[PDB]
Design a protein around this ligand. Structure first.
Ligand SMILES: Nc1ncnc2c1ncn2[C@@H]1O[C@H](COP(=O)(O)OP(=O)(O)OP(=O)(O)OP(=O)(O)OP(=O)(O)OC[C@H]2O[C@@H](n3cnc4c(N)ncnc43)[C@H](O)[C@@H]2O)[C@@H](O)[C@H]1O
Length: 214
């Protein structure tokens, strides 16, 4: 089963990627998690990426496509995979299309800009695992601490409100057209599309996607 998650930064894609991984047993390919992993390893990728991400900009299509190609051409990607953060631009999409890769489901998380900025102030991560929490809407069971390890949570560096606002501008210019892109793909029979209300609580969003995938 091959799935793509679309939606503005903060819409809760990664939050629901976790659940979809652990309930249908397909790997999460997160471009954001891979970039943040590269910084932590201190690789060449990590060094090129850090400044771009800090500035709330998109990393070049070439680097991203190479990165995602590598991680697909690993093992256990025969049963399926879940893309989260990719594609992010039309060229990223067309590259996948031209390489002959089709997806079964394209899932869109609609959430307006207002909420997005209010959300991200409450976002907390367990940096080793990439587990994501919201202090109000999806809180850790112990304030400030990862549920699994008890390790202190941090805020992401690119989560200051200036940087967030840039990510949304980029999203509306570069990424939003992908909605049209995959609607049309769905219309031609090449995939299934579905929208959801991501403003809903995290259990109600979980529910709609059970209701959608089966
Ligand atoms: N493909 C690419 N091409 C070029 N560059 C790339 C790239 N991919 C990555 N990059 C680079 O690096 C950065 C992008 O970062 P990236 O890692 O791709 O995104 P996030 O930063 O992972 O943003 P999503 O945009 O992934 O947010 P989310 O939808 O997953 O929702 P989340 O569950 O976290 O939720 C938000 C907060 O949501 C709270 N919350 C979740 N659900 C609910 C709910 N249902 N109700 C209320 N609150 C909720 C969450 O718990 C948490 O508090 C890129 O911008 C660029 O810098």
């Amino acid at each position: 089963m091959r799935i793509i998650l679309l939606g503005a930064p903060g819409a809760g894609k990664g939050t629901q990627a976790q659940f979809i991984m652990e309930k249908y047993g397909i790997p999460q390919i997160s471009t954001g998690d891979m970039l943040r992993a590269a910084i932590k390893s201190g690789s060449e990728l990590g060094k090129q990426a850090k400044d771009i991400m800090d500035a709330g900009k998109l990393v070049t299509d070439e680097i991203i496509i190479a990165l995602v190609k590598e991680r697909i051409c690993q093992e256990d990607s025969r049963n399926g995979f879940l893309l989260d953060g990719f594609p992010r631009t039309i060229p990223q999409a067309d590259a996948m299309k031209e390489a002959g890769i089709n997806v079964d489901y394209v899932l869109e998380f609609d959430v307006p800009d207002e909420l997005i900025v209010d959300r991200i102030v409450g976002r907390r991560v367990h940096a080793p695992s990439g587990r994501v929490y919201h202090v109000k809407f999806n809180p850790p069971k112990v304030e400030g601490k990862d549920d699994v390890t008890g390790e202190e949570l941090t805020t992401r560096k690119d989560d200051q409100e200036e940087t967030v606002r840039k990510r949304l501008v980029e999203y509306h210019q570069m990424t939003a057209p992908l909605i049209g892109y995959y609607s049309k793909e769905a219309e031609a029979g090449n995939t299934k599309y579905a929208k959801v209300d991501g403003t809903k609580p995290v259990c109600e969003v979980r529910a709609d996607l059970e209701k959608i995938l089966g």
